Amino acid sequence: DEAEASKFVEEYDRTSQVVWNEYAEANWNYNTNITTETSKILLQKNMQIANHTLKYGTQARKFDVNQLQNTTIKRIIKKVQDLERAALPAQELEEYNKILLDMETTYSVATVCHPNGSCLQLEPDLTNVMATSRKYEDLLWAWEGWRDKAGRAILQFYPKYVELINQAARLNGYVDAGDSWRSMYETPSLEQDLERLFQELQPLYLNLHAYVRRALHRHYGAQHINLEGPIPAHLLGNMWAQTWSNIYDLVVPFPSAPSMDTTEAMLKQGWTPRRMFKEADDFFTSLGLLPVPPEFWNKSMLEKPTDGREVVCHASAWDFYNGKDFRIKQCTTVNLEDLVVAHHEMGHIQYFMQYKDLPVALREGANPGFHEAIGDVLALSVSTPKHLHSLNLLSSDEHDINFLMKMALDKIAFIPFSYLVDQWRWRVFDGSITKENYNQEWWSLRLKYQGLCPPVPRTQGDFDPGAKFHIPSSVPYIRYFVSFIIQFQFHEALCQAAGHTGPLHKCDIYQSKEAGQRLATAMKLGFSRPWPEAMQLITGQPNMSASAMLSYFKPLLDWLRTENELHGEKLGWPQYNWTPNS
Amino acid sequence: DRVYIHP
Ligand SMILES: *[C@@H]1O[C@H](CO)[C@@H](O[C@@H]2O[C@H](CO)[C@@H](O[C@@H]3O[C@H](CO)[C@@H](O)[C@H](O)[C@@H]3O)[C@H](O)[C@H]2NC(C)=O)[C@H](O)[C@H]1NC(C)=O
Ligand SMILES: *[C@@H]1O[C@H](CO)[C@@H](O)[C@H](O)[C@H]1NC(C)=O
Ligand SMILES: [Cl-]
Ligand SMILES: [Cl-]
Numbered sequence: 001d002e003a004e005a006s007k008f009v010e011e012y013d014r015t016s017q018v019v020w021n022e023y024a025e026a027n028w029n030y031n032t033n034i035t036t037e038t039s040k041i042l043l044q045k046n047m048q049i050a051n052h053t054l055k056y057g058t059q060a061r062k063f064d065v066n067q068l069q070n071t072t073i074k075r076i077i078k079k080v081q082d083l084e085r086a087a088l089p090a091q092e093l094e095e096y097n098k099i100l101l102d103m104e105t106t107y108s109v110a111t112v113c114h115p116n117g118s119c120l121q122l123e124p125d126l127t128n129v130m131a132t133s134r135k136y137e138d139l140l141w142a143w144e145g146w147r148d149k150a151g152r153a154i155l156q157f158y159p160k161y162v163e164l165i166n167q168a169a170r171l172n173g174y175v176d177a178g179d180s181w182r183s184m185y186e187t188p189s190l191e192q193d194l195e196r197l198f199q200e201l202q203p204l205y206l207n208l209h210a211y212v213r214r215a216l217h218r219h220y221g222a223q224h225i226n227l228e229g230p231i232p233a234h235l236l237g238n239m240w241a242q243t244w245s246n247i248y249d250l251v252v253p254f255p256s257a258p259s260m261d262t263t264e265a266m267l268k269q270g271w272t273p274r275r276m277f278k279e280a281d282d283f284f285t286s287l288g289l290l291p292v293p294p295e296f297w298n299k300s301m302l303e304k305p306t307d308g309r310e311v312v313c314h315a316s317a318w319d320f321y322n323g324k325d326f327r328i329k330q331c332t333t334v335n336l337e338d339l340v341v342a343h344h345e346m347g348h349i350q351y352f353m354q355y356k357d358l359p360v361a362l363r364e365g366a367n368p369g370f371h372e373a374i375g376d377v378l379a380l381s382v383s384t385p386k387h388l389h390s391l392n393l394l395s396s397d398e399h400d401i402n403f404l405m406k407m408a409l410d411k412i413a414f415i416p417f418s419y420l421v422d423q424w425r426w427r428v429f430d431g432s433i434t435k436e437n438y439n440q441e442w443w444s445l446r447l448k449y450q451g452l453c454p455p456v457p458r459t460q461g462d463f464d465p466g467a468k469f470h471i472p473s474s475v476p477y478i479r480y481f482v483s484f485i486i487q488f489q490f491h492e493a494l495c496q497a498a499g500h501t502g503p504l505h506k507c508d509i510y511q512s513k514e515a516g517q518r519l520a521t522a523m524k525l526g527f528s529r530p531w532p533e534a535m536q537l538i539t540g541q542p543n544m545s546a547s548a549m550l551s552y553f554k555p556l557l558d559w560l561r562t563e564n565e566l567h568g569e570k571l572g573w574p575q576y577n578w579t580p581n582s
Numbered sequence: 583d584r585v586y587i588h589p
């Protein structure tokens with residue numbers, strides 16, 4: 001009956017709270033200090049948490065979820081029926097846990113070295129090279145080097161990882177791991193929805209792509225850029241060419257409308273990692289939202305350690321399942337990019353604090369895309385020239401188009417990349433792409449979606465997906481695609497909630513209590529209701545929609561079409577088989 | 583648990 005159901009849920013929540021808190025401590029200890037000792041402890045704590053998952057998960061499966069009255073209790077028990085990795089037999093589980101840790105450690109300690117010289121780490125060294133160098137061969141060195149050292153080293157683990165994660169998925173009632181991952185959205189038409197959203201943003205991407213390709217042609221020379229072909233993947237200012245904002249100087253629509261160098265400003269004016277997170281905190285509280293607790297500042301790792309110890313540098317936010325302990329771990333560099341990243345991570349923390357009073361089983365975003373979007377929404381307002389000037393980091397129509405271009409280089413360029421990652425992965429999980437086709441199929445999608453080509457031919461042993469954090473880390477990626485669509489939807493709604501009129505891209509929601517209240521009511525729901533409810537509460541409607549993003553960039557689309565047509569650009573890459581002759 | 587970035 002209903003009495004036995006709510007009793008079970010209560011017991012589950014009490015015990016999960018304690019054991020997940022213990023696991024988090026062990027996880028944090030490894031992530032902020034990679035050693036044999038901390039690795040061993042984490043693997044042991046994995047086994048502990050799995051015994052808890054198996055125990056309650058087995059009990060959960062005795063309940064007929066669809067015979068239960070209460071929909072909150074229904075959602076919890078259904079979720080507990082999914083054991084995840086704990087469904088695996090003991091020895092397979094320990095193998096799986098070891099594989100995950102080996103992949104993570106391998107990625108986190110990988111270096112690219114000059115012969116008899118310095119060894120560069122991904123953050124900050126190779127990131128800086130990719131962002132600042134305008135020398136074809138130096139960029140190639142970093143790009144190829146990272147894939148030679150990180151990508152190739154991951155390959156030996158990946159097939160077995162795939163086999164084990166699929167096995168876990170099947171034992172939990174899914175057909176493969178991709179099926180399992182997509183189900184987090186509880187949206188049967190997810191694939192169709194995502195495809196249509198991608199389609200709607202093609203005109204804008206193809207126009208941005210063609211404009212950038214022309215600018216690259218001017219800088220790197222006619223012998224190295226085919227104006228009707230894909231762009232070499234090492235030229236976009238980012239290791240994965242996932243965001244292109246670092247090549248702004250090469251593409252600026254109006255050089256006669258120059259903007260302040262934001263990095264120098266931050267460095268000259270004495271910005272620090274701590275002050276960067278404080279400014280994000282200040283934006284959140286200005287909306288009437290919650291401040292981070294005192295403990296956050298005591299326990300967080302907001303910069304790379306100097307005692308030579310190995311860490312997982314990739315920015316992350318941590319819920320210790322206590323309602324009190326929340327942390328950010330980020331190897332922060334003093335620049336505008338990482339200020340944006342800081343807001344993103346603080347969005348996660350805000351979400352943690354908003355739903356901390358829910359049962360632990362419901363302490364998640366409405367869907368994974370929602371969790372990613374929160375910080376980005378506020379960052380959109382932070383990014384406005386108006387607001388950046390108020391922070392003394394920047395000093396009309398030309399500047400407007402300049403700004404839109406700058407925003408498109410991050411936001412628009414990321415749409416096809418964030419779509420591609422899990423398109424590749426779902427097909428690996430479903431067996432459509434085998435281990436013999438891993439890399440070739442990755443570059444087929446890189447071409448199809450992004451219009452990029454590798455600068456150098458790929459060889460046997462290459463596993464370029466391995467060189468992207470989320471692949472060895474086993475973190476789903478489609479959430480970021482969803483995030484980039486919906487954050488503009490959130491922006492549009494919060495802007496009219498704040499009374500702002502005029503072009504969407506000029507909106508700054510700073511200090512708006514009405515905008516804060518709308519985000520708050522949705523965030524408080526956690527995972528307790530289907531996501532269209534949270535979507536409805538923020539936006540006044542229940543769908544994912546590209547309309548807001550299109551509206552934001554409307555003036556840029558018009559300007560790009562004009563510019564591309566007058567320069568005679570072919571939109572797309574008709575000569576799709578072109579690769580560098582170099 | 584732990585939530586990242588593009589990311
Ligand atoms: C199904 O079960 C859930 C969980 O046991 C019930 O949800 C609970 O509903 C009460 C109101 O009836 C919520 O109280 C609310 O929060 C605060 C503190 O309790 C209170 O001051 C407010 O006035 C407000 O009413 C409670 O938070 C909520 N619990 C959870 C976990 O969401 C629900 O009522 C049951 N549904 C049915 C149809 O019986
Ligand atoms: C790092 O790991 C060592 C064990 O090698 C441990 O004793 C120490 O507490 C950890 N933390 C730091 C900051 O070194
Ligand atoms: Cl790549
Ligand atoms: Cl996801």
Ligand SMILES: [Zn+2]
Pocket residue numbers: 344345348371372585586587588589
């Ligand atoms: Zn994130």
